[PDB]
Structure formats: structure tokens, C-alpha cells
Amino acid sequence: AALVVDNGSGMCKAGFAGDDAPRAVFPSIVGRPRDSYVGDEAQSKRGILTLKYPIEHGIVTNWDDMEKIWHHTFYNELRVAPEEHPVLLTEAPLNPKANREKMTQIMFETFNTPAMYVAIQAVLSLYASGRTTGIVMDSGDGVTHTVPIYEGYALPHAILRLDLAGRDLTDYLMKILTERGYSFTTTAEREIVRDIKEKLCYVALDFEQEMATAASSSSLEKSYELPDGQVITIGNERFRCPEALFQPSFLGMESAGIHETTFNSIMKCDVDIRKDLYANTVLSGGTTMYPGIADRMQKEITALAPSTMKIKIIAPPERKYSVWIGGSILASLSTFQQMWISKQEYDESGPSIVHRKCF
């Protein structure tokens, strides 16, 4: 059996090839005292330790903490020995080549994996939608990526990286929930706010009209029960928190919204292919799971795009783990057994074999 590991900016999704969903989804954090706790242990260890993301915006910056997360993944989460299972790993768009080789070296030398493979997260989401040409709007935990792909080849000159993602929305919801009198400050209370965000938040088609609706009634108010039994109510904060995706000025940011970042990357491509990109905009990632986000994305992009063009936003129901699901389907194919990079091949061509075998 092969292992599929999706190294997200904030959450690590791991499992076995052929399964419908990842077995383990844990935070991609390494906590050290204010000895070293990785994953959910760092979350459930009080505010006595500092938390650090080795992957924070899709790119591995600390390779010592990344090994700790991978060791935690195989032994504590997957409960398997990496030396007995091939591992399929996913890499962010615009990943430096040096980082790609370092990932290969760690698997074969630190974990002694018999076989290993690297895939691009964006192309796995696009392939899972039955498409080879299109633009993928992958909004995750710490980074949002708009990757235009034409005939299976991502266009590096047009890939836009946006630091706005679910992590900034969780902190924004904490800030605006204190307006109602709810004090969410500790690390334990941050996880509660994330649950509220993932259950009661939605994207409003018309933000200004929705704000008037909330202020003139209570039909939008919803109740959430805290772990200790207290029930809190949330009103206009349900659609205000994900509105920061389309209006980053709510967070004090300079960057454009996810709709404008998608439009900017499309306009950075050749005119011949812009029509196909406009009609093949695929959403992926956890932050794209808000209800009504496809309708809002369709309306906002239509305003920016020319009237003659056709805009289609694809939001598959499995888009939350579309990167992992695509990798699991690929790694479980009987024809994929020849696409792996063996240990024997590694110690004959070095880490540079990843550029020839993969990519």
C-alpha cells in the first residue's frame, strides 16, 4: 500500500492510496516551550509554548521542523513504518527546485522510503475535476493560489500567490466576535472560533444588501454551543468573516480579493487561452467550502471580465480534499507502480532524479 501526504500550509492530510478520504488531518505546527510537540499535541498543551509553522505559505522554510511533522505523520498519525510503504508527496505551485530535491533526499535518507513521488497540488485538483486546461483557485489555510493551467502545463509567469486564507479569516472572526462581548483570545478558544467559522459562516451574494437584512431582522442569527455548554449567538459576523476574501481591506491588507487575483492571473496569459480559463475556473481548498462562494465568485468575475465572455466557476463537492483525493486515485492505479522513484534509482542519480521521473 502507498501513502499519500498532502503538505498543506496549515493542515497535513495523510492517508493510504485507494481510500476515499485521508485518514489523518492534523495541524502542521511544531510547538516548543515558551521539549517539542507536533500536531494536535501542540494545540492541546495550553498557552505555555510557542507555535511555529515550517510550511506557512506553501513553501517549506524550516526543514528541521518538517522532518518532525513527517515523523509524526507516519508513526503517530498513519501508524506505519515509512520504510515499507511508498509515499506520494504534493508540492505547492512555484516550488523552488532546491526544495524539491531536499524533499526527495529526506524521504530516501531520513525515512528510507522504498519509493517516492512528487505531484503539484494544483494539477491534482484540476485533474480530479476531469479537466486538463483551466485555472485553479486553491484557497487553503495560510496561502491562496491562482494557478492557470493550459494542457496540463501550469503557467509560471501567471501564477499569483495571495497570503489571505482561512488562517486570517479565523483571526478576523475572533476580532469581530469580541464586538458582541465574546472574548476569544487563548489558543483553545481559537479552535472554537474555527469550528464556528466552518459551521455558521457563509458568503453573501450582495454584502451591502445582506448587512441591511441583518440589521433589520434576526433571521440570519444563529446559535452555537460552546464546549462547556454556554450558547452564543452570531449575526452579521456569519457573512462578514468570509467577506474579507473579496475585500481584504477588512484585514488592513493591500492585496486584491480572490476574485480580482483570479482575474489578474487570467489576464496575465495569452489572449487565445483566456476564453478557456474563464470557463474552467476550478475551486479547491478548505477556504472555498463556504456556501455561496461559487455564486459570489461568478458574479464578481463577470463584472471584471468582458461581457462577451462566458464565466463558469467549478465547485465540486469534494474540493476540500481534491488534492489528496487525486493523489490517492493516482497512486492506487496498477499502472502507477512504474512511475515511482525507487531507492535504487535515487542512489544512482541523486536528488536530481525527481526532475526527470516527476515533472
Partner 1 sequence: ASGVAVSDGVIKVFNDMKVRKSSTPEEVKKRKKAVLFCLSEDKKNIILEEGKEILVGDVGQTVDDPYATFVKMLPDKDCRYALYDATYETKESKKEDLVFIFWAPESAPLKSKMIYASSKDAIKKKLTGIKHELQANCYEEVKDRCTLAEKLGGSAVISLEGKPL
Partner 2 sequence: MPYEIKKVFASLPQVERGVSKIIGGDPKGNNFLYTNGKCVILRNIDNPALADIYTEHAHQVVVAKYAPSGFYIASGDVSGKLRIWDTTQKEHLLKYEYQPFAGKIKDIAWTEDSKRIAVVGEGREKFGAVFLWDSGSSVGEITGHNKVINSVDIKQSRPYRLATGSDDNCAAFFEGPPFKFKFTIGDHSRFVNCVRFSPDGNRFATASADGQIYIYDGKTGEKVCALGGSKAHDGGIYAISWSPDSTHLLSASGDKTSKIWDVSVNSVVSTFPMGSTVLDQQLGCLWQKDHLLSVSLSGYINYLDRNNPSKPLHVIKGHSKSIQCLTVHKNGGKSYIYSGSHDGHINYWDSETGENDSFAGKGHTNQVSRMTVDESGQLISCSMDDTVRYTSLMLRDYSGQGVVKLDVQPKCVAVGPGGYAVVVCIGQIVLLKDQRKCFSIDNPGYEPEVVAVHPGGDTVAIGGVDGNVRLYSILGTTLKDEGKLLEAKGPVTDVAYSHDGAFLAVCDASKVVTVFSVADGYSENNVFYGHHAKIVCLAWSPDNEHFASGGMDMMVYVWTLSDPETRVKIQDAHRLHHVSSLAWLDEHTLVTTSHDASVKEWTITY
List 209, 216, 307, 338, residue binding partner 1 (CB under 8 A): 338
CB 297 within 8 A of CB 258: yes
3-class SS of residue 318: coil
Residue 161 in the binding site for ligand ADP (CB under 6 A): no
**Single-letter residue type at 335:** T
Give the C-alpha distances (Å, rounded to integers) separating 173 from 76, 193, 202, 322, 329.
Answer: 32, 7, 12, 26, 36
List 312, 318, 326, 329, residue binding partner 2 (CB under 8 A): 312
Instruction: Please list the alpha-helical segments (H only) found in 248-342.
Output: 258-266, 271-278, 293-304, 322-331
Q: Which is nearer to Mg ion, 54 or 140 (CB)?
A: 140
Q: At closest approach, how far in Å is the CB of 142 from ligand ADP?
A: 5
Cell, residue 291? 456556501
337 Cβ contact partners less than 8 Å away, ≥ 6 residues apart? none
Q: Which is nearer to ligand ADP, 73 or 114 (CB)?
A: 73
Residue 290 in the binding site for ligand ADP (CB under 6 A): yes
133 Cβ contact partners less than 8 Å away, ≥ 6 residues apart? 149, 150, 151, 152, 273, 276, 277, 280
Footprint on this chain of a copy of itself (rule: CB under 8 A): 34, 46-47, 56-57, 59, 61, 94, 96, 99, 155-158, 163, 175-176, 178-181, 183, 185-187, 249, 251-255
**Partner that binds at residue 99, options a copy of itself, partner 2, partner 1, none, CB closer than 5 to 8 Å by kind:** a copy of itself
- Identify which of 134, 295, 128, 144 has the alpha carbon closest to the alpha carbon of residue 206: 295
List 3, 5, 9, 72, residue binding ligand ADP (CB under 6 A): 9
Cell, residue 222? 444563529
How many Cβ atoms sit within 10 Å of the Cβ of residue 294? 18
Q: Which is nearer to partner 1, 171 or 295 (CB)?
A: 295
Residue 167 in the binding site for ligand ADP (CB under 6 A): yes
Pairing of β 3-7 and β 87-91: parallel
**Longest CA span, the chain:** 70
User: Taking the alpha carbons of 313, 318, 323, 328 in that order, is the dihedral positive or negative?
Assistant: negative
Residue 296 in the binding site for ligand ADP (CB under 6 A): no
Residue 131 in the binding site for partner 1 (CB under 8 A): yes
* Ranges within 137-166 binding partner 1 (CB under 8 A): 151-152
Q: Which helix (H) or strand (E) holds 120?
A: strand 115-120
Q: At closest approach, how far in Å is the CB of 312 from partner 2?
A: 5
Give 288-308 as a DSSP string: G-STTHHHHHHHHHHHHS-TT
In terms of C-beta distances under 8 Å and separation of at least 24 residues, what long-range contacts does 46-49 make, across chains too? 46/187, 46/188, 47/186, 47/187, 47/188
Q: Which is nearer to a copy of itself, 181 or 317 (CB)?
A: 181
Residue 303 in the binding site for partner 2 (CB under 8 A): yes
**Partner that binds at residue 10, options a copy of itself, ligand ADP, partner 1, none, CB closer than 5 to 8 Å by kind:** ligand ADP
**Single-letter residue type at 174:** M
**Partner that binds at residue 298, options Mg ion, ligand ADP, a copy of itself, none, CB closer than 5 to 8 Å by kind:** none
Q: At closest approach, how far in Å is the CB of 341 from partner 1?
A: 13
Residue 79 in the binding site for partner 1 (CB under 8 A): yes
CB 92 within 8 A of CB 58: yes
Residue 112 in the binding site for partner 1 (CB under 8 A): no
Residue 187 in the binding site for partner 1 (CB under 8 A): no
Q: At closest approach, how far in Å is the CB of 337 from partner 1?
A: 8
Query: Where does this chain bind partner 2 (CB under 8 A)?
Result: 206, 209, 212-213, 216-219, 279, 295, 298-299, 302-304, 307-308, 310-313, 338, 344-345, 348-350, 352-353, 356
Query: Where does this chain bind ligand ADP (CB under 6 A)?
Result: 8-11, 140-142, 166-167, 170, 194, 197-198, 285-287, 289-290
